[PDB]
Nucleic acid binder design. Sequence first.
RNA 1: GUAGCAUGAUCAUCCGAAUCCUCUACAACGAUUUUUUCCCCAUUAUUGAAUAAUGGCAAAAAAUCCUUGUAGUGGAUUCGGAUGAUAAUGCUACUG
Lengths: 16, 1544
Amino acid sequence: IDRYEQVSKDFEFIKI
Amino acid sequence: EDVEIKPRGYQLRLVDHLTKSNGIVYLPTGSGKTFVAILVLKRFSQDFDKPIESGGKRALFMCNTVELARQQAMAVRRCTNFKVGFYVGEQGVDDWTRGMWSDEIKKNQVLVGTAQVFLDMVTQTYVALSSLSVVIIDECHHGTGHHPFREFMRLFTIANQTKLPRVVGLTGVLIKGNEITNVATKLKELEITYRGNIITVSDTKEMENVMLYATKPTEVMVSFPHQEQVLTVTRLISAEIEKFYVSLDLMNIGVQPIRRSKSLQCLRDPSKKSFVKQLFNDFLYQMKEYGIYAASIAIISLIVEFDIKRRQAETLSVKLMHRTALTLCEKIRHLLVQKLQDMTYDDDDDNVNTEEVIMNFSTPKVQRFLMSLKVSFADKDPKDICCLVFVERRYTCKCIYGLLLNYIQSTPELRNVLTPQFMVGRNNISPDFESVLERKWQKSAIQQFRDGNANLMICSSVLEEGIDVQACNHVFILDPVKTFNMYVQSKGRARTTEAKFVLFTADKEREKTIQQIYQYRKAHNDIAEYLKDRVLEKTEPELYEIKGHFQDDIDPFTNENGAVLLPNNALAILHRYCQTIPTDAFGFVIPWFHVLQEDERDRIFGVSAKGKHVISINMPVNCMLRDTIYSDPMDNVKTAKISAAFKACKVLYSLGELNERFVPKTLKERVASIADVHFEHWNKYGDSVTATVNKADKSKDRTYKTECPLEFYDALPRVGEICYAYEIFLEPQFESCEYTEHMYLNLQTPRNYAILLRNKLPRLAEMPLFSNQGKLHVRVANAPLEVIIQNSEQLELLHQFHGMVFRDILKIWHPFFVLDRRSKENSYLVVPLILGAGEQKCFDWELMTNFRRLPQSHGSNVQQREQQPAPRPEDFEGKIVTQWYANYDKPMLVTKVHRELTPLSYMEKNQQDKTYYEFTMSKYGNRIGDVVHKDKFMIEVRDLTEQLTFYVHNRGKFNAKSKAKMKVILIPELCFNFNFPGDLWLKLIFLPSILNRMYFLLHAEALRKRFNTYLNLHLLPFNGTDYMPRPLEIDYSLKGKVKPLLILQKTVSKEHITPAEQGEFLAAITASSAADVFDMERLEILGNSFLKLSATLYLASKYSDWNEGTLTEVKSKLVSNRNLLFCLIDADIPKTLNTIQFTPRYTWLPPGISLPHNVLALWRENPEFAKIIGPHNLRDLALGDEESLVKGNCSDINYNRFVEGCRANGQSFYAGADFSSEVNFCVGLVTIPNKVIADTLEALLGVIVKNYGLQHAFKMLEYFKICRADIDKPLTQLLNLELGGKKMRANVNTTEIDGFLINHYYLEKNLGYTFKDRRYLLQALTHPSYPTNRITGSYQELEFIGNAILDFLISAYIFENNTKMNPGALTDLRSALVNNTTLACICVRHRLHFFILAENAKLSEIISKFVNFQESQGHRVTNMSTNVDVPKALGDVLEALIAAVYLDCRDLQRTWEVIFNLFEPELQEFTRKVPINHIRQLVEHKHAKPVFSSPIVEGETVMVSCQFTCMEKTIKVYGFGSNKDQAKLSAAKHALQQLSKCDA
RNA sequence: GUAGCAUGAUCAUCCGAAUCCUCUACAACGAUUUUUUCCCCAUUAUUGAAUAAUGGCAAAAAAUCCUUGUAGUGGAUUCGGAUGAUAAUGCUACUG
Ligand SMILES: Nc1ncnc2c1ncn2[C@@H]1O[C@H](COP(=O)(O)OP(=O)(O)O)[C@@H](O)[C@H]1O
Ligand SMILES: [Mg+2]
Ligand SMILES: [Mg+2]
């Protein structure tokens, strides 16, 4: 895959 | 702090409940539990004041880690007013002893430390468990299995079960590990092990809300997608790493210690190779887990660690492999940075470029981590935010630190808010990235976190517990949550309000993490409710199950004195004792464990051996436990090891190797045990060997009394008794020239004088003298002449004549001198003899009747000279004259009478026109006036030398023709005439030297008689005497086939025995300070060598069951100066020594003269007043002839005036003056340095050896109570010293030893000797690092006696052969000839290195270096050696196989043959050239002035700045060296080479 | 007899060198021990499925001991160099 994918740049924390 | 620290409502009830009963308090971390603990400690402050024996007690505060212990110690110290003792293993209590342990106990009320330290202190009986008040236990959850807490608690079970101290445990977590299910059994185990009942808050709404100020955190979870794709670069890295692994396994280094499984079932890789492989595996795991850029960060840490390891790599092969690993890691870093920059081309702005690279070249989980950070802190104030991050691996912490630093620098928003830091456990990794010790630092990472310098901390579980950390608000967990305890403690760390607990995990493990967290929450909730609903029991009083809790193991054994040996500490005790034994680097201390075999198991044990496992414990050959020991049959190999070690240590204690306190014994215990046997006599002198404080003022030197020999004691003849007259004779050894014939003819006249005695005098040796004109000899008649003093007035006249001789003729008189009437000490007379009835020599009654007092030379004038009678030639021929006319008041001796010559005759020389008379007028006419009887004759006179001490040869250009070139002719009428037999006068000046030397010779003869009687020799050569010799090589007195040694020959054959003559004894007595022609320093070396040999042999044959170290220490202690002095003082010898230079007029007392008897008594009665009497006071008294003749005691008014003058010194400068240097000889006292006595003991031993031999000399040691010889083995103290010293280990016979020794014949032919027993050679060849041998012991026990044998043999040879060369360099020659490096050169010369049955990594390399260096030098001594270093073991094994050769032969003659055969070239080289001085000769060089700075050793290198001077210049040079002193030695060697080249 | 020069020895004081060490505070080194955890494997009880028992393989945590180096001391022995001063010896002038 050569280049690692970008995880969600916008990501608000989830609460258990 | 102060008293403002106020407990809450629950702490008071907790303390009240804990007072009534023991228990474990359980509260969340940060609830103030330490405060309630110290509050409990307040309630036990009753017995802390009183000491232990008075009935008081102390307290114990327990901790598991050093830093936590220190923190709580300072906390309690600031929170109370108790003397807080702090003891840890690092502090140095390992060598603490009884008294300064007890004073520490009594000087403290509360004690803190690590569990091992307190456990060791308790087991060693420093305190009794019943002597304690309360033992506070912290982090009590650690107490399971073999943890030190449980072991310490067991002592409560094994100690007295009454009046036992309170125990309380502290924790915030109760369980360690994954043992959550069925909490109740674990909790009950904790209950019983600490014999307490857990107490926790239950009154909810009152103080649960209160203590919840340490609020629980909010827990959130964030997932990340898995990564699956594998980059090609990763597989390239893997391929390179695996091929490097293969190469590393293939490549060869020296022999290394062998490691294997924990159960030892399977082998393992070597330690260092395992270490490097482990580092590489950790790096691979890092790069797998975190990606690419993180590996780029961590490869720097790998580089720095590998470089540091190479730098400290002593072995060349280790350096090579570390360099190879460094090259591999450098290639990895090059590829990594190449790939890193491969995508940096896009944007030229470094900030965003590095940021996007971080988000690009990293695993997604770290990316989510970074977004979490960025949106969490969101550019807030830096000081407020204090977050924590936990990771598992150590190198992970440094890697994430590097990544975080790079990101923070790449984020300007976070570039000023986050100041991270990382910290890990004890196996510390250098936080630097560049080089070792770049700069020093003093703030711990924890400290910087506490100061706000580090708002972020990266750490493993090392920061989970204990360490005081202020209330943090954020905690992040990267690696998966593992244990219940760490999870609960971490969530308890988040103490402040609205603290966030955050953790990250992969998507596919979300359900597993949910299960784990819910399981842990259940584990906490059921525990809480179980405590809330538990059964009300008091203190777990069920003693039966309490004992059943521990019975499963091996029951600990306790001996008397209360010392108890914990089985779980058996491994520690045994390994520590093994470490106490000295060894080289590879020389293994670990007892090589082994696992048995079932066939062997039932071959050695019964049928039960098949069910369970048995093992064996071996012992390195250095110790005496050569017999192997087998463990009891145990199921698991673990308890098998425990049992094996326990039994082994029990046997060791039984042998006494372990002290009573169950700790290995040092040399102090050995010397303490030996003191009451071999150093008993020190007590009578107020000193002891164990008193190490005696090492302070050893230079102090004491005084001694003196007494004349027995013959001279109270031997004044009595009137009416028989008396012995002993004639003196004078034979001029020199031939006389024309200017000296007067003395030569005069002293040979038959008219001589004699010494008069009332006791008989033994035969005396002929004595040499050194006149101003030649050499002289003196002999004393053997057969005395017999007279009886019928007239008391004859005796009175004799005494008057003897007194007046010293009073007038020799000018020895003193104002206080008085003829002795008491006649006790050194009383006798000397009387002249005249030719009597032919052969008879009666007394010169004429001289004494006339010359009672010498008349005074008066200045006769012309007027009285007219009627004075003319001078008769007979009246003046050979008579004493003096020149009263001139200023010269000394006496004169005439030689011949010039009858034909007359005044007005010209002086022959230089005044052929000037006559004697006219010259006399021109010279002293104002005084003489004129000469009457002008036609009379003249005479010829010669001077009498004023010198009195003729011992030293006054070497010089006397110029016999020029000294008396002037000729002295006088008119008789102008000089006084002492009509006297001038020959008697010129003999009389030599009297004092003869008197003193015969005074000492009498002591010498008495000693010779004593040592001939005590050793019981009364054979034919006992009688007679020999002429006294003199030495030339004594500085001041300037003017094939081996030859068998004579000492061994006389010790084996009595035909060559020779009787000891007075001269040798006297020389042994004459100190070098009393500078005569000889002294003892030539015999001192032989005495020292023989004493060393005798002490070595006796100790070896007496304490053969001891190791080399204690034997060496004791042997050195034996021949110490203190012990020799103490053993000699009670031998009654020192009061008969010759130490003081003999100056008669001021430092000598005449025989017939003493002080006044009354003042003698006053001096001998007032020691408080003796020390103030001064020589001026003594000279103050003016005693005329009456006082010195008729009374013997001064006048009472004069007595009072003298004592007043003595007392007046107190208020003057005379007070406190060291008058002993001037007045000790007035009462027969003297002060002698202790070194003199230490020398004279060996001096006597040397002659007693030389004349007789070893065997007879052996008795002398026991005579001086040197060694308490055993009567149970009489042959030991006489002959078994050359026949004993072995035990069982040199008795078994087997051919297997030929397996150990390969081509032994080659070594035997190189050495020259043939061994009847090869076992001795193997023992001497048994280096300590050689486990495979089990038939014989090590080589130290052989080297110990080899050293003594070699040094004694070489000293005997150099003394017997190297004659014409002074002892001051003989000591240097022997020291050089016994040097270890010389022995190493000898060993490599015959290539004995090949046969050294040893194995070691660095030792093999260093011996290879030394041997190839010597090959380069061609097996020649480089006089020292410029090589890097020398192997001590090489010279050791050579000089040990010397003793092996002796023991195989048991013949000192063969030993000398072989030693000479290898030492021939080196002996002829050292005895021809200057042997060696080195170093010092540069310092004291005529123009070379070398000074040096502090050398620093760096790994395998050391440099030193050599600041010297050469050829009137100053040059700066360096040299290759090993250590600091070796750097100095190499610099000195280079300076020596430069000086030699400059001279050349 | 009188001076100068040279020399030997000794005390005292200062400094140095060699050997042996001790103590202090700091740092490094190596070894051993104890707890905990994961993975995998083996052997059994049973044969496949499934279990159980242990035993072994890697990771984290904690203690103890030894060694080395840094410097300061301090001590013992040997010994040198420097110097007041003391006394001794020899020589070279002035002589007696
Ligand atoms: N009732 C109280 N009285 C006095 N000090 C308290 C009280 N409650 C809490 N503290 C303080 O709060 C601190 C809590 O931290 P500490 O108890 O040392 O951590 P741990 O609970 O791990 O021992 C204590 O140092 C203590 O001084
Ligand atoms: Mg913080
Ligand atoms: Mg605490």
